[PDB]
Amino acid sequence: APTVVHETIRVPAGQTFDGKGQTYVANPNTLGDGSQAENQKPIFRLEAGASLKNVVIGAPAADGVHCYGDCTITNVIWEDVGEDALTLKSSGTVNISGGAAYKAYDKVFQINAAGTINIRNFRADDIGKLVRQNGGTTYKVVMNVENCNISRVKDAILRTDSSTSTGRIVNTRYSNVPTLFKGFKSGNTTASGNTQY
Ligand SMILES: [Ca+2]
């Protein structure tokens, strides 16, 4: 059944939360409405090495998923991204495979610590950017996109301000995307097997 989430669901270190394909929305009074209003609460808080899987986040999506360290996100669908889809709050590696993200006013993925994010076999439509490293920071984030299909991007698929962050987009279909990468020093971008459509 759709659950209205009132308080953030914590997923302890190394554990999985399987939503079994069920929908989870935020309570707008306790977590946030999914607007651009700053610092809304995550619907899911993942501890290091935790996994979230087979979950549908519906609107109001507040500030989606935060990961404190490594997290694997498998077949999770953001039907309408709130403030952000998933944020990396502490250093680590985010791995996404499968799922989808729609209607993100600005970013789907926000990386707020040094780390990696691999996004595989993901559908994302009508978004500002797929991954933004927190603005101005100069720590290294490795951004990697494989076998995705990304469309109607306001700004860029991958965006950074750090001269050590790397961006890799491989075998991805994309449409109405202004730039693939934005802000990387020359030599810090890789791309192959992509298709503009
Ligand atoms: Ca939205």
Side-chain angles (χ1 to χ4, degrees):
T3 302
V4 180
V5 176
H6 299 295
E7 349 189 7
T8 298
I9 299 165
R10 260 216 195 200
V11 189
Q15 274 308 126
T16 312
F17 172 107
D18 193 337
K20 302 181 180 180
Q22 299 309 289
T23 302
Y24 293 82
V25 313
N27 180 299
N29 294 339
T30 60
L31 306 187
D33 64 345
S35 69
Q36 298 155 240
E38 296 196 305
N39 127 181
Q40 287 167 63
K41 294 171 74 68
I43 287 178
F44 288 92
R45 195 182 155 146
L46 295 245
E47 296 309 312
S51 303
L52 178 64
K53 74 182 314 173
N54 307 319
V55 156
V56 171
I57 295 166
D63 200 22
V65 183
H66 297 0
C67 302
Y68 285 76
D70 295 332
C71 59
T72 305
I73 306 300
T74 311
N75 180 36
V76 167
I77 294 170
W78 286 265
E79 289 177 343
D80 188 332
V81 170
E83 196 202 338
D84 312 271
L86 182 138
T87 307
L88 182 64
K89 306 279 282 174
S90 301
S91 192
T93 302
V94 185
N95 275 292
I96 290 107
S97 59
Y102 302 91
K103 301 160 165 284
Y105 186 82
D106 187 12
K107 41 234 201 289
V108 175
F109 303 113
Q110 161 62 342
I111 310 303
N112 285 347
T116 302
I117 182 160
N118 299 295
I119 295 151
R120 305 192 169 89
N121 314 109
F122 192 81
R123 185 61 178 98
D125 182 71
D126 173 22
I127 63 180
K129 57 277 282 160
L130 195 66
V131 185
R132 243 240 73 153
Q133 174 170 347
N134 203 19
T137 74
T138 53
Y139 48 67
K140 186 171 168 183
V141 174
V142 168
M143 305 176 183
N144 171 50
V145 180
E146 287 175 349
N147 293 261
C148 297
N149 178 359
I150 309 306
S151 54
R152 300 193 255 143
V153 182
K154 296 180 174 166
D155 174 35
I157 291 182
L158 261 27
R159 192 168 180 186
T160 189
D161 293 307
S162 158
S163 64
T164 37
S165 297
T166 63
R168 183 174 178 249
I169 295 171
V170 135
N171 301 316
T172 291
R173 320 216 302 137
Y174 67 88
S175 179
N176 298 319
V177 167
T179 4
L180 302 169
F181 310 90
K182 189 165 183 172
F184 299 79
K185 177 179 180 180
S186 296
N188 276 1
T189 42
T190 337
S192 43
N194 299 311
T195 292
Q196 189 189 267
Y197 72 90

